[PDB]
């Protein structure tokens, strides 16, 4: 499992996205959400940014 050392300060395009995933604590110090894409690229916003929590609600 992968781990984020940095975060995007912008918000990612709604249209372009696809899947979602959430980290493994013991592994990754910072808990965060990983967003895949139509492009098959895994951007990752460090949450607390509601923009994320909403997007994930759109996912779910």
């Amino acid at each position: 499992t992968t781990c984020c050392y940095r975060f995007i300060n912008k918000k990612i395009p709604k249209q372009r996205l696809e899947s979602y995933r959430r980290t493994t604590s013991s592994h990754c110090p910072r808990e965060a959400v990983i967003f895949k894409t139509k492009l098959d690229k895994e951007i990752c916003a460090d949450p607390t940014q509601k923009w994320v929590q909403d997007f994930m609600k759109h996912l779910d």
């Binding site: 992968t2 940095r6 912008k10 492009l39 690229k41 951007i43």
Partner: protein, 217 residues
């Protein structure tokens, strides 16, 4: 330069992007990893579509794998292409814990003209400053383990094989050397950037070197 100069001269009043990455990755091999010199690198661009808009999403991705470790670098413009023209690794084929250096660079407009991002009041610069996303990520290949000018990027790493990460990144006016300022001078860091900038510039004493340069024109 011979050309770059003549060019920047003959092109005073507009701005072309140059994007530049430098990155030292600390590596840790799997106990079952076998030493190897193999290196695979690749660049791939793509032009997907912002449904809502009339404006295409452009994207350039560089990738390279060596020493059990694979890297992927993804730059995504809304309405602007910054084509990666080149990637280079410096890497160490042993089992030893070691460093892996990753260069990535855009095209020189004076090799092949990128867009003048300044046209129409700096429309492009709007597009970049606001829209451009950058996504770096690092993994372990197929090796198996025993169980505001602040550039806006995301780094995800598989920590099993990755010990450390340091990088300096920039997206800047491709002629800022011959200009006082520019409206495109974005920069980014993570850990000792200015250091890895110094160091990358000469690891070719103590590593294998592979790299890919795309055809000019």
């Amino acid at each position: 330069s011979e050309e770059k100069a003549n060019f920047c001269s003959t092109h005073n009043d507009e701005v072309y992007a140059r994007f530049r990455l430098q990155m030292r990755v600390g590596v840790r091999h799997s106990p079952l990893y076998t030493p190897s010199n193999m290196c695979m690198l690749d660049i791939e661009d793509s032009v997907e579509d912002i449904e809502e808009s009339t404006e295409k999403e452009y994207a350039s991705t560089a990738t390279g794998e060596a020493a059990g470790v694979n890297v992927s670098v993804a730059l995504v413009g809304e309405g602007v292409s910054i084509p990666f023209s080149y990637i280079g690794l410096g890497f160490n084929p042993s089992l030893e814990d070691s460093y892996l250096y990753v260069n990535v660079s855009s095209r020189a407009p004076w090799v092949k003209q990128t867009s003048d991002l300044s046209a129409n009041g700096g429309w492009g610069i709007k597009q970049v400053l606001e829209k451009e996303l950058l996504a770096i990520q690092i993994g372990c290949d197929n090796q198996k383990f025993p169980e505001p000018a602040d550039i806006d990027f995301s780094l995800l790493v598989d920590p099993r094989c990755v010990t450390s990460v340091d990088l300096h990144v920039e997206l800047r006016d491709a002629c800022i050397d011959y200009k006082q300022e520019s409206p495109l001078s974005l920069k980014g860091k993570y850990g000792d950037g200015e250091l890895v900038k110094k160091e990358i510039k000469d690891v070719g004493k103590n590593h294998n070197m592979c790299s890919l340069n795309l055809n000019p024109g």
